Amino acid sequence: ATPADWRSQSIYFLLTDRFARTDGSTTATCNTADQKYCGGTWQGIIDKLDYIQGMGFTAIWITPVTAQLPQTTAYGDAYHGYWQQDIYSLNENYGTADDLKALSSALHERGMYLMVDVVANHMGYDGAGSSVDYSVFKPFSSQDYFHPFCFIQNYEDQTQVEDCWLGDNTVSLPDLDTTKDVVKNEWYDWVGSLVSNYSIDGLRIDTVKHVQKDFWPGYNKAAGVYCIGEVLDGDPAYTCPYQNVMDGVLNYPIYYPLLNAFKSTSGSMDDLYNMINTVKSDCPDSTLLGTFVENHDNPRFASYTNDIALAKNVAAFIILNDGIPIIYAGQEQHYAGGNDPANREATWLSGYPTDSELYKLIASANAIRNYAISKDTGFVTYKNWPIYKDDTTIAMRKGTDGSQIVTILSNKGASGDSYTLSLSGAGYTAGQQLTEVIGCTTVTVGSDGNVPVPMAGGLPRVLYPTEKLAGSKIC
Ligand SMILES: *[C@@H]1O[C@H](CO)[C@@H](O)[C@H](O)[C@H]1NC(C)=O
Ligand SMILES: [Ca+2]
Ligand SMILES: [Gd]
Ligand SMILES: [Gd]
Ligand SMILES: [Gd]
Ligand SMILES: [Gd]
Numbered sequence: 001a002t003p004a005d006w007r008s009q010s011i012y013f014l015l016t017d018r019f020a021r022t023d024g025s026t027t028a029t030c031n032t033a034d035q036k037y038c039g040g041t042w043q044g045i046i047d048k049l050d051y052i053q054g055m056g057f058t059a060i061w062i063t064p065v066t067a068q069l070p071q072t073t074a075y076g077d078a079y080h081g082y083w084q085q086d087i088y089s090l091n092e093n094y095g096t097a098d099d100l101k102a103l104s105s106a107l108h109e110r111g112m113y114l115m116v117d118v119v120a121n122h123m124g125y126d127g128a129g130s131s132v133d134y135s136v137f138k139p140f141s142s143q144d145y146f147h148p149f150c151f152i153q154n155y156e157d158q159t160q161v162e163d164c165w166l167g168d169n170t171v172s173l174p175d176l177d178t179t180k181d182v183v184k185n186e187w188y189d190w191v192g193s194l195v196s197n198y199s200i201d202g203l204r205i206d207t208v209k210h211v212q213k214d215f216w217p218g219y220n221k222a223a224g225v226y227c228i229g230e231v232l233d234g235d236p237a238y239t240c241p242y243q244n245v246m247d248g249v250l251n252y253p254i255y256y257p258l259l260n261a262f263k264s265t266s267g268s269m270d271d272l273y274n275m276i277n278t279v280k281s282d283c284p285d286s287t288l289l290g291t292f293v294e295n296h297d298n299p300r301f302a303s304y305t306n307d308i309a310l311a312k313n314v315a316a317f318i319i320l321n322d323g324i325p326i327i328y329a330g331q332e333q334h335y336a337g338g339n340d341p342a343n344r345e346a347t348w349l350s351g352y353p354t355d356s357e358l359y360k361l362i363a364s365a366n367a368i369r370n371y372a373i374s375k376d377t378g379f380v381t382y383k384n385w386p387i388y389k390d391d392t393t394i395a396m397r398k399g400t401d402g403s404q405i406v407t408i409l410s411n412k413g414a415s416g417d418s419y420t421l422s423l424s425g426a427g428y429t430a431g432q433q434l435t436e437v438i439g440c441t442t443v444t445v446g447s448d449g450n451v452p453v454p455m456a457g458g459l460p461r462v463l464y465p466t467e468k469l470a471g472s473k474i475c
């Protein structure tokens with residue numbers, strides 16, 4: 001689907017091997033330390049779409065679907081999908097081609113989109129870079145398709161970052177020479193066929209900073225759908241320029257200050273506030289970026305603090321910020337795993353409860369976002385504007401005048417005192433009645449235009465004009 005089509009989406013990102021098994025078991029063993037295939041499948045995802053859609057998500061992003069290296073290495077199996085070897089075969093662990101097609105059909109059946117994770121940078125190999133038998137890669141069955149074997153020693157050296165290999169001598173990641181026309185033509189033809197065969201609506205591209213810039217325009221075009229790239233860097237000056245060769249990129253610039261602002265009661269609200277303005281100003285289009293605070297490459301939010309008020313605040317931010325919201329499976333169940341492999345916990349071990357605190361929060365946030373968008377076609381391109389900020393609060397406004405959503409976030413935590421915040425700059429007309437769609441209560445805009453926001457337990461507050469909510473089943 002197009003970039004314009006994707007702006008209104010909300011993504012639930014999941015690891016296919018760790019989300020849902022075909023049998024639907026909630027007890028099937030999965031110790032992250034073992035790093036093996038735990039049994040998640042595409043059919044399993046289909047059976048749990050009610051669970052996902054029940055949170056208000058409009059799309060899912062699943063890990064890579066290509067055939068991987070077969071071995072159980074010293075670092076485990078290729079359960080995550082980032083160690084591919086045969087791109088014209090699917091990973092039998094997740095199911096068959098028919099199953100992947102059934103998944104895309106099941107999503108479309110619900111008016112949802114399927115986003116697939118793809119890797120163009122490298123293959124995977126069990127063993128030292130010197131022992132690589134290039135004949136096992138399809139269609140790149142020759143070392144002529146790859147860059148000479150070297151590891152990335154200095155990540156500040158862009159040439160090294162692009163020309164040398166990821167991984168190490170235990171599990172090496174043969175780096176494709178993406179400067180060669182043969183490699184480009186192959187990848188471009190492949191991606192177009194992949195999207196066509198499985199009716200894929202969008203792509204998430206892995207390790208974009210590791211491939212030279214001139215590769216991506218042709219890739220994005222051949223894909224024929226919206227593409228969001230993973231550029232793993234917190235500097236907006238480094239990451240945002242990739243949006244000039246790709247539709248969107250993951251918002252790593254916001255990630256760091258967002259995490260720091262809420263991971264404790266003493267986080268910097270200033271850094272988050274300024275980064276919102278910086279991305280708003282320096283990135284080609286902030287509304288085509290993907291907002292997140294949790295994924296499989298960083299410790300989960302709850303690993304820093306189990307304060308569920310802090311967790312609710314950051315979840316609210318991800319859903320209401322500029323761009324496409326992205327929640328990582330397990331976040332809604334307050335998962336707290338640390339770095340790889342601790343952050344690849346099986347979602348099924350939680351039992352899938354739909355009444356968990358974070359499930360309800362996400363459902364309420366997505367609900368008003370989805371509704372607002374059906375109310376206001378200008379919402380998605382209306383730049384999120386930070387309207388207020390202090391030591392423990394940040395407030396923002398997004399949406400056309402008269403239909404805007406005003407969000408107030410706090411890092412005071414669950415023990416936060418109860419008080420009233422006189423919020424100014426919300427843009428609402430004096431006397432207008434509003435609804436706090438999270439706790440479902442009403443508040444009237446003061447005669448001065450300021451909103452007397454009832455603050456308690458460090459809970460986030462999301463406001464929207466009450467009259468606009470008629471018809472909705474919200475609150
Ligand atoms: C697409 O489908 C055709 C057969 O219908 C198959 O031969 C080809 O390998 C597929 N391409 C990809 C990238 O999966
Ligand atoms: Ca590379
Ligand atoms: Gd089923
Ligand atoms: Gd259903
Ligand atoms: Gd860097
Ligand atoms: Gd990556």
Ligand SMILES: [Gd]
Pocket residue numbers: 233234235238
């Ligand atoms: Gd950097």
Ligand SMILES: [Gd]
Pocket residue numbers: 281282
């Ligand atoms: Gd600027």
